[model samples]
Target: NSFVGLRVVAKWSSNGYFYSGKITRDVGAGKYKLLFDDGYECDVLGKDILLCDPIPLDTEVTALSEDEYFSAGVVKGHRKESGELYYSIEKEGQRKWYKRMAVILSLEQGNRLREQYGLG
Candidate 1:
Protein backbone atom coordinates (compact mmCIF):
# COMPACT_ATOMS: atom_id res chain seq x y z
CA ASN A 1 0.00 0.00 0.00
CA SER A 2 2.61 2.54 -1.17
CA PHE A 3 -0.35 4.77 -1.85
CA VAL A 4 -0.76 4.52 1.92
CA GLY A 5 1.46 7.50 2.66
CA LEU A 6 0.11 9.44 -0.26
CA ARG A 7 -3.11 11.36 -0.73
CA VAL A 8 -5.67 10.13 -3.25
CA VAL A 9 -9.26 10.26 -4.28
CA ALA A 10 -11.41 7.72 -2.47
CA LYS A 11 -15.11 6.98 -2.51
CA TRP A 12 -17.31 6.22 0.45
CA SER A 13 -19.78 3.39 -0.13
CA SER A 14 -22.30 5.41 1.79
CA ASN A 15 -21.92 8.65 -0.20
CA GLY A 16 -21.05 7.28 -3.65
CA TYR A 17 -18.74 10.19 -4.46
CA PHE A 18 -14.94 10.53 -4.49
CA TYR A 19 -13.19 12.25 -1.57
CA SER A 20 -9.57 13.24 -1.08
CA GLY A 21 -7.40 11.91 1.75
CA LYS A 22 -4.14 10.26 2.65
CA ILE A 23 -3.93 6.48 2.75
CA THR A 24 -2.51 6.85 6.25
CA ARG A 25 -2.03 3.16 6.92
CA ASP A 26 -3.25 -0.34 6.37
CA VAL A 27 -5.93 -1.57 8.71
CA GLY A 28 -5.40 -5.10 7.45
CA ALA A 29 -8.04 -7.22 5.62
CA GLY A 30 -7.13 -5.20 2.56
CA LYS A 31 -8.78 -2.29 4.32
CA TYR A 32 -6.78 0.88 4.93
CA LYS A 33 -7.09 3.88 7.18
CA LEU A 34 -7.79 7.18 5.49
CA LEU A 35 -7.05 10.60 6.96
CA PHE A 36 -9.45 12.68 4.94
CA ASP A 37 -8.47 16.11 3.71
CA ASP A 38 -11.95 17.40 4.35
CA GLY A 39 -11.33 17.01 8.10
CA TYR A 40 -12.96 13.56 8.31
CA GLU A 41 -11.59 10.07 8.75
CA CYS A 42 -12.17 6.45 7.75
CA ASP A 43 -10.99 3.77 10.14
CA VAL A 44 -11.01 1.02 7.52
CA LEU A 45 -11.47 0.78 3.77
CA GLY A 46 -10.52 -1.54 0.94
CA LYS A 47 -7.28 -0.66 -0.79
CA ASP A 48 -8.88 -1.49 -4.13
CA ILE A 49 -11.38 1.32 -3.57
CA LEU A 50 -8.62 3.86 -4.06
CA LEU A 51 -9.04 5.37 -7.52
CA CYS A 52 -6.24 6.80 -9.64
CA ASP A 53 -7.14 9.73 -11.86
CA PRO A 54 -5.11 12.24 -13.84
CA ILE A 55 -6.89 15.07 -12.06
CA PRO A 56 -4.49 16.99 -9.82
CA LEU A 57 -5.36 18.60 -6.49
CA ASP A 58 -6.70 22.11 -6.80
CA THR A 59 -6.60 21.48 -10.51
CA GLU A 60 -9.27 24.09 -10.25
CA VAL A 61 -10.27 26.65 -7.60
CA THR A 62 -12.17 29.88 -6.98
CA ALA A 63 -13.74 32.09 -4.36
CA LEU A 64 -17.31 31.23 -3.36
CA SER A 65 -18.31 34.61 -1.99
CA GLU A 66 -16.89 37.92 -0.79
CA ASP A 67 -14.39 38.52 2.08
CA GLU A 68 -15.13 37.10 5.59
CA TYR A 69 -17.95 35.12 3.97
CA PHE A 70 -15.18 34.31 1.45
CA SER A 71 -14.02 30.73 1.06
CA ALA A 72 -11.83 28.92 -1.46
CA GLY A 73 -11.39 25.32 -2.54
CA VAL A 74 -10.93 23.01 -5.48
CA VAL A 75 -13.31 24.23 -8.14
CA LYS A 76 -12.44 22.36 -11.33
CA GLY A 77 -15.39 23.79 -13.21
CA HIS A 78 -18.79 25.36 -12.85
CA ARG A 79 -21.36 23.23 -14.59
CA LYS A 80 -24.87 24.19 -13.65
CA GLU A 81 -28.04 23.21 -15.47
CA SER A 82 -30.78 23.97 -12.96
CA GLY A 83 -29.37 27.15 -11.47
CA GLU A 84 -26.02 27.61 -9.59
CA LEU A 85 -22.78 27.67 -11.58
CA TYR A 86 -19.89 26.80 -9.28
CA TYR A 87 -21.07 23.22 -9.44
CA SER A 88 -18.52 21.02 -7.67
CA ILE A 89 -15.27 21.02 -5.72
CA GLU A 90 -12.64 18.42 -5.01
CA LYS A 91 -12.15 17.62 -1.31
CA GLU A 92 -11.78 20.88 0.56
CA GLY A 93 -15.27 22.09 -0.38
CA GLN A 94 -18.50 21.05 -2.09
CA ARG A 95 -20.37 21.64 -5.36
CA LYS A 96 -23.69 23.24 -6.17
CA TRP A 97 -25.26 25.09 -9.08
CA TYR A 98 -24.61 28.85 -9.04
CA LYS A 99 -26.20 31.47 -11.25
CA ARG A 100 -23.00 31.86 -13.35
CA MET A 101 -19.43 32.90 -12.66
CA ALA A 102 -20.33 32.33 -9.07
CA VAL A 103 -16.65 31.77 -8.28
CA ILE A 104 -14.47 32.65 -11.27
CA LEU A 105 -10.81 32.66 -10.19
CA SER A 106 -9.91 30.05 -12.73
CA LEU A 107 -6.43 28.46 -12.27
CA GLU A 108 -5.96 29.24 -15.97
CA GLN A 109 -3.70 32.03 -14.67
CA GLY A 110 -1.40 29.60 -12.93
CA ASN A 111 -0.49 30.19 -9.22
CA ARG A 112 -0.71 33.93 -9.50
CA LEU A 113 -3.23 34.08 -6.71
CA ARG A 114 -1.53 31.43 -4.65
CA GLU A 115 1.57 33.58 -4.77
CA GLN A 116 -0.22 36.46 -3.14
CA TYR A 117 -3.02 35.02 -0.99
CA GLY A 118 -0.77 32.97 1.31
CA LEU A 119 -1.97 30.89 4.29
CA GLY A 120 -4.23 27.84 4.42
Candidate 2:
Protein backbone atom coordinates (compact mmCIF):
# COMPACT_ATOMS: atom_id res chain seq x y z
CA ASN A 1 0.00 0.00 0.00
CA SER A 2 3.03 2.30 0.16
CA PHE A 3 3.50 2.55 -3.59
CA VAL A 4 1.15 5.32 -4.53
CA GLY A 5 2.89 8.11 -6.42
CA LEU A 6 6.21 6.32 -6.37
CA ARG A 7 8.34 6.37 -9.50
CA VAL A 8 8.72 2.89 -10.96
CA VAL A 9 9.63 0.90 -14.00
CA ALA A 10 6.36 -0.10 -15.58
CA LYS A 11 6.56 -3.26 -17.60
CA TRP A 12 4.00 -2.97 -20.34
CA SER A 13 3.85 -6.73 -20.92
CA SER A 14 6.01 -9.87 -21.02
CA ASN A 15 7.18 -8.02 -24.09
CA GLY A 16 10.03 -7.60 -21.58
CA TYR A 17 10.34 -3.83 -21.84
CA PHE A 18 9.93 -1.06 -19.32
CA TYR A 19 9.66 2.69 -19.02
CA SER A 20 9.76 5.26 -16.21
CA GLY A 21 6.57 6.60 -14.77
CA LYS A 22 4.99 8.04 -11.67
CA ILE A 23 1.92 6.29 -10.29
CA THR A 24 -0.73 8.98 -10.58
CA ARG A 25 -3.87 7.15 -9.52
CA ASP A 26 -5.39 3.76 -8.86
CA VAL A 27 -7.51 2.29 -11.59
CA GLY A 28 -8.87 -0.26 -9.10
CA ALA A 29 -8.69 -4.05 -8.75
CA GLY A 30 -4.91 -4.34 -8.47
CA LYS A 31 -4.35 -2.21 -11.55
CA TYR A 32 -2.46 1.12 -11.75
CA LYS A 33 -1.61 3.90 -14.15
CA LEU A 34 1.62 5.59 -14.99
CA LEU A 35 2.51 9.22 -15.66
CA PHE A 36 5.92 9.52 -17.21
CA ASP A 37 8.37 12.30 -16.37
CA ASP A 38 7.86 13.55 -19.90
CA GLY A 39 4.04 13.59 -19.73
CA TYR A 40 3.22 10.17 -21.11
CA GLU A 41 0.69 7.79 -19.57
CA CYS A 42 -0.07 4.06 -19.52
CA ASP A 43 -1.67 1.37 -17.42
CA VAL A 44 -0.05 -1.62 -15.74
CA LEU A 45 -0.56 -4.24 -13.08
CA GLY A 46 0.91 -3.81 -9.62
CA LYS A 47 3.08 -6.87 -10.04
CA ASP A 48 4.68 -5.45 -13.19
CA ILE A 49 5.69 -2.23 -11.46
CA LEU A 50 9.12 -2.05 -9.94
CA LEU A 51 10.22 0.67 -7.55
CA CYS A 52 12.80 3.06 -8.97
CA ASP A 53 13.15 6.24 -6.99
CA PRO A 54 16.35 8.23 -7.57
CA ILE A 55 17.78 9.66 -4.36
CA PRO A 56 18.99 13.25 -4.31
CA LEU A 57 22.03 12.67 -2.15
CA ASP A 58 25.00 10.82 -3.57
CA THR A 59 25.43 8.38 -0.68
CA GLU A 60 25.64 4.59 -0.39
CA VAL A 61 24.33 2.77 2.70
CA THR A 62 24.88 0.04 5.24
CA ALA A 63 23.34 -0.95 8.54
CA LEU A 64 23.70 1.45 11.44
CA SER A 65 23.93 -1.39 13.92
CA GLU A 66 27.29 -2.09 15.47
CA ASP A 67 26.46 -5.06 17.67
CA GLU A 68 24.88 -7.15 14.92
CA TYR A 69 25.61 -7.80 11.25
CA PHE A 70 23.51 -6.11 8.60
CA SER A 71 23.09 -5.64 4.87
CA ALA A 72 23.92 -2.69 2.64
CA GLY A 73 21.61 -0.47 0.65
CA VAL A 74 20.97 3.03 -0.71
CA VAL A 75 18.13 5.49 -0.49
CA LYS A 76 16.05 4.84 -3.56
CA GLY A 77 12.86 6.58 -2.49
CA HIS A 78 11.10 8.41 0.29
CA ARG A 79 7.62 9.03 1.60
CA LYS A 80 5.91 11.80 3.55
CA GLU A 81 4.13 11.48 6.83
CA SER A 82 2.79 14.39 8.83
CA GLY A 83 5.04 16.68 6.76
CA GLU A 84 8.19 14.73 7.64
CA LEU A 85 10.33 12.90 5.08
CA TYR A 86 11.18 9.26 5.62
CA TYR A 87 13.72 7.40 3.50
CA SER A 88 13.30 3.88 2.22
CA ILE A 89 16.46 2.02 1.30
CA GLU A 90 16.52 -1.02 -0.93
CA LYS A 91 18.95 -3.92 -0.67
CA GLU A 92 18.55 -6.88 -2.99
CA GLY A 93 14.82 -6.40 -3.52
CA GLN A 94 14.27 -5.85 0.19
CA ARG A 95 13.27 -2.35 1.34
CA LYS A 96 12.76 -0.39 4.53
CA TRP A 97 12.22 3.14 5.78
CA TYR A 98 10.90 4.73 9.00
CA LYS A 99 13.98 3.01 10.44
CA ARG A 100 16.79 3.38 7.93
CA MET A 101 20.00 2.56 9.76
CA ALA A 102 22.83 4.67 8.32
CA VAL A 103 24.37 6.28 5.29
CA ILE A 104 27.39 4.09 4.42
CA LEU A 105 28.63 5.66 1.19
CA SER A 106 29.34 4.04 -2.16
CA LEU A 107 32.92 4.11 -3.48
CA GLU A 108 32.29 7.46 -5.11
CA GLN A 109 29.87 8.52 -2.42
CA GLY A 110 32.22 7.15 0.20
CA ASN A 111 34.95 9.49 -0.97
CA ARG A 112 32.47 12.32 -1.18
CA LEU A 113 31.27 11.65 2.34
CA ARG A 114 34.79 11.51 3.67
CA GLU A 115 35.71 14.84 2.15
CA GLN A 116 32.47 16.50 3.31
CA TYR A 117 32.35 14.65 6.57
CA GLY A 118 31.78 15.53 9.96
CA LEU A 119 34.33 12.50 9.88
CA GLY A 120 36.64 10.27 7.81
Candidate 3:
Protein backbone atom coordinates (compact mmCIF):
# COMPACT_ATOMS: atom_id res chain seq x y z
CA ASN A 1 0.00 0.00 0.00
CA SER A 2 1.05 3.58 -0.55
CA PHE A 3 1.65 6.05 2.21
CA VAL A 4 -1.36 8.27 2.74
CA GLY A 5 -0.58 10.62 5.60
CA LEU A 6 1.15 11.01 8.90
CA ARG A 7 -0.37 9.79 12.13
CA VAL A 8 0.95 11.76 15.05
CA VAL A 9 0.30 10.82 18.64
CA ALA A 10 1.50 12.14 21.96
CA LYS A 11 0.76 9.12 24.07
CA TRP A 12 4.40 8.22 23.91
CA SER A 13 7.51 10.09 22.92
CA SER A 14 9.64 9.05 19.99
CA ASN A 15 12.87 7.66 21.39
CA GLY A 16 12.14 9.75 24.43
CA TYR A 17 13.45 12.61 22.37
CA PHE A 18 10.82 13.72 19.83
CA TYR A 19 7.17 13.07 19.13
CA SER A 20 6.03 9.94 17.33
CA GLY A 21 4.87 9.81 13.70
CA LYS A 22 4.59 7.36 10.85
CA ILE A 23 6.36 7.50 7.51
CA THR A 24 5.26 5.97 4.24
CA ARG A 25 7.82 5.24 1.56
CA ASP A 26 8.23 3.08 -1.50
CA VAL A 27 9.64 -0.36 -0.88
CA GLY A 28 10.68 -2.14 -4.01
CA ALA A 29 7.69 -1.75 -6.36
CA GLY A 30 5.08 -1.26 -3.67
CA LYS A 31 4.70 1.16 -0.80
CA TYR A 32 5.40 0.44 2.87
CA LYS A 33 5.21 2.20 6.17
CA LEU A 34 7.82 3.18 8.71
CA LEU A 35 7.51 4.72 12.16
CA PHE A 36 9.54 7.74 13.13
CA ASP A 37 10.03 9.63 16.27
CA ASP A 38 12.93 11.79 17.28
CA GLY A 39 11.91 14.66 15.05
CA TYR A 40 10.53 13.15 11.88
CA GLU A 41 7.28 11.96 10.35
CA CYS A 42 6.08 11.30 6.82
CA ASP A 43 3.01 10.29 4.87
CA VAL A 44 2.39 7.56 2.34
CA LEU A 45 2.45 10.14 -0.41
CA GLY A 46 5.84 11.36 0.73
CA LYS A 47 4.63 14.35 2.69
CA ASP A 48 6.84 14.68 5.72
CA ILE A 49 6.27 16.26 9.11
CA LEU A 50 9.70 17.49 9.94
CA LEU A 51 9.72 18.80 13.46
CA CYS A 52 12.45 21.27 14.32
CA ASP A 53 15.21 19.18 12.74
CA PRO A 54 15.63 17.66 9.32
CA ILE A 55 15.37 13.87 8.91
CA PRO A 56 18.07 12.38 6.81
CA LEU A 57 16.43 10.31 4.08
CA ASP A 58 19.80 9.79 2.47
CA THR A 59 20.75 7.23 5.10
CA GLU A 60 20.84 3.61 4.04
CA VAL A 61 18.57 0.99 5.62
CA THR A 62 19.08 -2.69 6.18
CA ALA A 63 16.04 -4.91 6.17
CA LEU A 64 15.80 -7.06 9.26
CA SER A 65 12.75 -8.90 8.03
CA GLU A 66 9.72 -8.42 5.85
CA ASP A 67 8.18 -6.02 8.35
CA GLU A 68 11.26 -4.57 10.03
CA TYR A 69 14.37 -2.70 8.96
CA PHE A 70 17.29 -1.02 10.62
CA SER A 71 20.10 1.33 9.67
CA ALA A 72 23.11 0.85 11.90
CA GLY A 73 22.82 1.59 15.60
CA VAL A 74 19.08 2.08 15.97
CA VAL A 75 17.24 0.49 18.88
CA LYS A 76 13.61 -0.05 19.95
CA GLY A 77 11.82 -0.66 23.21
CA HIS A 78 8.31 -1.29 24.44
CA ARG A 79 6.46 -0.81 27.69
CA LYS A 80 4.65 -4.01 28.52
CA GLU A 81 2.26 -2.48 30.99
CA SER A 82 1.08 0.23 28.60
CA GLY A 83 1.73 -1.58 25.36
CA GLU A 84 3.59 1.49 24.19
CA LEU A 85 6.67 1.44 22.02
CA TYR A 86 9.41 3.94 21.26
CA TYR A 87 11.70 4.66 18.33
CA SER A 88 15.09 6.26 17.93
CA ILE A 89 18.00 6.71 15.58
CA GLU A 90 21.60 5.70 16.12
CA LYS A 91 24.83 6.04 14.25
CA GLU A 92 27.61 3.46 14.10
CA GLY A 93 30.65 3.53 11.91
CA GLN A 94 29.41 5.07 8.65
CA ARG A 95 25.81 3.92 9.02
CA LYS A 96 22.87 5.55 10.73
CA TRP A 97 19.86 3.55 11.87
CA TYR A 98 16.37 4.47 13.01
CA LYS A 99 14.78 2.47 15.82
CA ARG A 100 11.08 2.49 16.73
CA MET A 101 8.61 0.64 18.88
CA ALA A 102 5.49 -1.03 17.49
CA VAL A 103 2.42 -2.05 19.39
CA ILE A 104 -0.38 -4.18 18.05
CA LEU A 105 -3.48 -2.11 18.50
CA SER A 106 -7.08 -3.06 18.04
CA LEU A 107 -9.17 -0.57 16.12
CA GLU A 108 -10.54 0.81 19.33
CA GLN A 109 -7.19 0.75 20.99
CA GLY A 110 -5.59 2.52 18.07
CA ASN A 111 -8.25 5.19 18.15
CA ARG A 112 -7.75 5.68 21.85
CA LEU A 113 -4.04 6.07 21.46
CA ARG A 114 -4.47 8.55 18.66
CA GLU A 115 -7.13 10.60 20.33
CA GLN A 116 -5.58 10.57 23.76
CA TYR A 117 -2.19 11.50 22.41
CA GLY A 118 -3.57 14.21 20.10
CA LEU A 119 -1.96 12.45 17.18
CA GLY A 120 -4.99 12.63 14.94
Model 1 C-alpha RMSD vs. true structure (Å) is 13.9
- Candidate 1 stretches greater than 4 Å from native: 51-120
Q: Over the full model, what C-alpha lDDT does candidate 2 score relative to the true structure?
A: 0.55
What's the lDDT for residue 6 in model 1?
Answer: 68
lDDT (0 to 1) per candidate: 0.47, 0.55, 0.32
**Model 2 lDDT per residue over 1-120, tens place:** 546778764554534444446788888887887886557677777766656443333245553445665556766776777865566777777777733223233333333333333110
For residues 3-73, write the lDDT of model 3, one tens digit per residue: 33445322222322223466444444323344655554332222222221122232221213235632333
**Candidate 1 steric clashes:** 4
- How many residue pairs of model 3 clash at the backbone? 6
Rank candidates by lDDT, best first: 2, 1, 3
Quality of model 1 by C-alpha lDDT = 0.47
Q: How many residue pairs clash in each candidate?
A: 4, 0, 6
TM-scores of the candidates are 0.41, 0.40, 0.21
Better of 2 and 3 by TM-score: 2
Cα error, candidate 2, residue 35 (Å): 0.8
Which structure among the candidates has the greatest lDDT? Answer: 2
1 versus 2: better TM-score goes to: 1
